[PDB]
Amino acid sequence: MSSFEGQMAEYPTISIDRFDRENLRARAYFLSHCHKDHMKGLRAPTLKRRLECSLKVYLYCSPVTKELLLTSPKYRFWKKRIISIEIETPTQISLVDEASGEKEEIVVTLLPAGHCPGSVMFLFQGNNGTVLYTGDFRLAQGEAARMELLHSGGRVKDIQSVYLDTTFCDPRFYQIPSREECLSGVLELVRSWITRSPYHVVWLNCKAAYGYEYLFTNLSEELGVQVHVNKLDMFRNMPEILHHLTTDRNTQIHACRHPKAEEYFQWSKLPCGITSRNRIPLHIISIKPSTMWFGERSRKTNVIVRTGESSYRACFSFHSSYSEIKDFLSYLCPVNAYPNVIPVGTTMDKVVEILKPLCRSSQSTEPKYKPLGKLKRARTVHRDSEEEDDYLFDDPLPIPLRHKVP
Amino acid sequence: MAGSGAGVRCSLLRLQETLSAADRCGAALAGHQLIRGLGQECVLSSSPAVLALQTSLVFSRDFGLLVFVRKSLNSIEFRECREEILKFLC
Amino acid sequence: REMKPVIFLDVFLPRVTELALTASDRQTKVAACELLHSMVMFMLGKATQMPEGGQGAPPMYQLYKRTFPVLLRLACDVDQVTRQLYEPLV
Amino acid sequence: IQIKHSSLITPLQAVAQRDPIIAKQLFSSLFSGILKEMDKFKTLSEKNNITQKLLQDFNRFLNTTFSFFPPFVSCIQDISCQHAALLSLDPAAVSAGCLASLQQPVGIRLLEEALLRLLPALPPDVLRWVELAKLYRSIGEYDVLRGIFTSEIGTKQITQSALLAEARSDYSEAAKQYDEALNKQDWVDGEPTEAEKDFWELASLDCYNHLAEWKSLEYCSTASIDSENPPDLNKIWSEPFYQETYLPYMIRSKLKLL
Ligand SMILES: [Mg+2]
Ligand SMILES: [Mg+2]
Ligand SMILES: [Zn+2]
């Protein structure tokens, strides 16, 4: 999910990954990647009506994001309003107002996120300092020190705020394995399965639309088989991905999707209508790459687990784990840090108190001096009546006199 | 507003001043944003002292939510605002 | 180049031994160990140098009595360099 | 044993860069050696000029400092102790440095060597005795304090009688004698010095503190800081001598009364 309101505190004139209610007054739109939770309001009728009444508002995103977005027929009205920006290329954006001729320049830099085709970061630099928006990123430990654009002369830049992805910001997802390990496990399993007979097929229950192209491409390169998907016209301008997918159902590896694909697999049938070739039945096994299932285990588990006679689960996460998030935020050391999404189990307060010790808040101060005036006793209640005998005791000490005047 | 020590109070003051911004849609959006902000702020509160302070501020008879809805009921532009107010009150 | 001021090294010996024994800093400890080795060599040279005048060699017994335990405890130190330096010396 | 001079000089200066005590000892030794070698190398006038420049630099060091690094101050004063030409340091600066760095013994040694060696060479000896008395009071040596006040500072018989009464824990008679001496006008022999009157004032403050006379104590701790009959308490923050002499007794008396 995306708990972001698509509006930074430093630059409220730009909205990122959210165009629902208050972002209709923004001067520039930014899109991290092409996931549905980061595209709320992008197809709204009010936004459609606003686009046809303005000329200076644009939608900035990665070129791969533009290719994936313009392929959908529902978003083709953005064809003349999308401006793609290369990664690691500092460009100047003009936040010109429509009504008044006022203008404001800001410098944005796109950084790779390693999440899905077209996923990038947004690094803004303007009058209110430097802010960073890492929407659904994935960085291993020790990789934050390798980003060239986040360093200024060998040291980390002065970052004011970080709107980081906190999908797995909880002690349950302590150290998620790298995607290479899950890839190797899935490759070994699929090889050992399909190497027996040409009728052994492997399903890949991939929930997200984008993010699993790495697995498909590497399985195709290591097995020579082409994965089956529903639609592949979206990758028509991406040769390195298009030549690994196929619409034909006569392939072994499959990654097709369907709302009722579970019952179909239970009936020994892929999501595609084909259930057998040449009237010879097919032997199907299901591999579901996910991460939330592994975050609920109670003992030592493996990357490739077997939950049934023809069912498997793989730990394939496109989100940074708790340790990776902590390492990234501690290396950046920003003034503030806001969670974009709250975990299902965790709440807002726990994520906030986890992220706070990592922020650059190393500034303490002694409490303000509370004055003490007008003492709480006016009259001397401890006064004596001065009745004595004056003979049992020695003479009183005479009052001293001091005439020195410096 | 200068009352930034307790963000709830300044949020309520800005929400009250919103009703005088010629009853426009942009004012409605700003008011809805302020309402959601003050709601998510009052929800995360856990200490009972600041909790009582916030529940006394939001139900005040000068800039509270009830007087805000009672005076904004004649304006159709603040439909989502009253809905979010009622949801936060629930 | 034009003078030779006389410096008495026995005023540094207690502090130098204390450092060589219990210095936390590695550079400070190794520097104190080298300085103590050089000072022990200087003590031997002074004790063996015979004044050609009527005065004999200065007695180093009061210095040996408190230097030898430090050298023994340094020659069996957990540190590799200190042990390899002070075992042949002992 | 056939080591080279470098094999001894390099580790020595290496340790000196990382240990302040070794650095303090090495600098003092080198300073004394170089000052001793120049006797057989220069003439009397050149040595006098060099020692005057050294004295000026040490006075500038002791006067311009805010951290009061104990090794640095102790090294400067120990170097000044070893040479009779550097014993003329500013006594006030030495005492302030020793009170700020908690190095009272080395300042006591410096002042005693200045009072001994420079004896044949306000008077400077009186100032040195006052600073030495303050340094001894700062460490709780009250017997030596009273000895100094009887032998060098005090010159009248009233001072001797008051100190004799104070030695027997008879603080009332001592305070009466001190008040009589402070209010006296007809001195047959001569007028008392300023140091003696300051000692009288401080000893009367001490006697009033011992007798738990809080009203007299608060009167005497503020009657000599301003000209107006109702004293302005903020005048204490003007003089560092005030901040050290009258502030503790005034605060104590006010707190006791409250
Ligand atoms: Mg998303
Ligand atoms: Mg994502
Ligand atoms: Zn299929």
From Swiss-Prot, chain A:
Which UniProt key words apply to this protein? Adaptive immunity, Disease variant, DNA damage, DNA recombination, DNA repair, Endonuclease, Exonuclease, Hydrolase, Immunity, Magnesium, Nuclease, Nucleus, Phosphoprotein, SCID
- This entry's Enzyme Commission designation comes to 3.1.-.-
Q: In which tissues is it expressed?
A: Ubiquitously expressed, with highest levels in the kidney, lung, pancreas and placenta (at the mRNA level). Expression is not increased in thymus or bone marrow, sites of V(D)J recombination.
- What GO cellular component is one of the record's annotations? nucleoplasm
Intracellular or extracellular location(s): Nucleus
Q: Which residues cross the membrane?
A: none
Q: Which GO terms describe its molecular function?
A: 5'-3' DNA exonuclease activity; 5'-3' exonuclease activity; damaged DNA binding; endonuclease activity; single-stranded DNA endodeoxyribonuclease activity
What's the effect of swapping H319A?
Answer: Abolishes PRKDC-dependent endonuclease activity and V(D)J recombination
Q: Name one GO biological process term.
A: interstrand cross-link repair
- The answer, when asked if Phosphoprotein is one of the entry's keywords, is yes
What residue stretch is flagged as signal peptide? none
Q: According to the UniProt record, what happens if one changes H38A? A: Reduces PRKDC-dependent endonuclease activity, although V(D)J recombination is largely normal
> What outcome follows a substitution of H33A?
Abolishes PRKDC-dependent endonuclease activity and V(D)J recombination
Modification Phosphothreonine, positions = T380
UniProt PTM comment: Phosphorylation on undefined residues by PRKDC may stimulate endonucleolytic activity on 5' and 3' hairpins and overhangs. PRKDC must remain present, even after phosphorylation, for efficient hairpin opening. Also phosphorylated by ATM in response to ionizing radiation (IR) and by ATR in response to ultraviolet (UV) radiation.
Quaternary structure annotation from Swiss-Prot or TrEMBL: Interacts with LIG4; the interaction is direct. Interacts with ATM. Interacts with BRCA1. Interacts with PRKDC. Interacts with TP53BP1. Also exhibits ATM- and phosphorylation-dependent interaction with the MRN complex, composed of MRE11, RAD50, and NBN.
Give the disease association.
Severe combined immunodeficiency autosomal recessive T-cell-negative/B-cell-negative/NK-cell-positive with sensitivity to ionizing radiation: A form of severe combined immunodeficiency, a genetically and clinically heterogeneous group of rare congenital disorders characterized by impairment of both humoral and cell-mediated immunity, leukopenia, and low or absent antibody levels. Patients present in infancy with recurrent, persistent infections by opportunistic organisms. Severe combined immunodeficiency Athabaskan type: A variety of SCID with sensitivity to ionizing radiation. A founder mutation has been detected in Athabascan-speaking native Americans, being inherited as an autosomal recessive trait. Affected individuals exhibit clinical symptoms and defects in DNA repair comparable to those seen in RS-SCID.
Q: Which family does it belong to?
A: Belongs to the DNA repair metallo-beta-lactamase (DRMBL) family.
- What protein does this entry describe? Protein artemis
From Swiss-Prot, chain B:
Organism whose genome encodes this protein = Homo sapiens (Human)
Record's protein name: DNA-dependent protein kinase catalytic subunit
Assembly mode: DNA-PK is a heterotrimer of PRKDC and the Ku dimer (composed of XRCC6/Ku70 and XRCC5/Ku86). Formation of this complex may be promoted by interaction with ILF3. Component of the core long-range non-homologous end joining (NHEJ) complex (also named DNA-PK complex) composed of PRKDC, LIG4, XRCC4, XRCC6/Ku70, XRCC5/Ku86 and NHEJ1/XLF. Additional component of the NHEJ complex includes PAXX. Following autophosphorylation, PRKDC dissociates from DNA. Interacts with DNA-PKcs-interacting protein (KIP) with the region upstream the kinase domain.
Role according to the record: Serine/threonine-protein kinase that acts as a molecular sensor for DNA damage. Involved in DNA non-homologous end joining (NHEJ) required for double-strand break (DSB) repair and V(D)J recombination. Must be bound to DNA to express its catalytic properties. Promotes processing of hairpin DNA structures in V(D)J recombination by activation of the hairpin endonuclease artemis (DCLRE1C). Recruited by XRCC5 and XRCC6 to DNA ends and is required to (1) protect and align broken ends of DNA, thereby preventing their degradation, (2) and sequester the DSB for repair by NHEJ.
The full protein's residues present here are 1 to 90 of 4128
Please state where this protein is localized. Answer: Nucleus; Nucleus, Nucleolus; Cytoplasm, Cytosol
Query: Its family?
Result: Belongs to the PI3/PI4-kinase family.
Q: Which disease is it linked to?
A: Immunodeficiency 26 with or without neurologic abnormalities: A form of severe combined immunodeficiency characterized by reduced or absent T and B cells, recurrent candidiasis, and lower respiratory tract infections. Some patients show dysmorphic features, severe growth failure, microcephaly, seizures, and impaired neurological functions.
Gene this protein is translated from: PRKDC
Q: Coiled-coil intervals in this record?
A: none
How is the protein altered post-translationally, as described in the entry? Autophosphorylated at two clusters, the T2609 cluster and the S2056 cluster. Autophosphorylation induces a conformational change that leads to remodeling of the DNA-PK complex, requisite for efficient end processing and DNA repair.
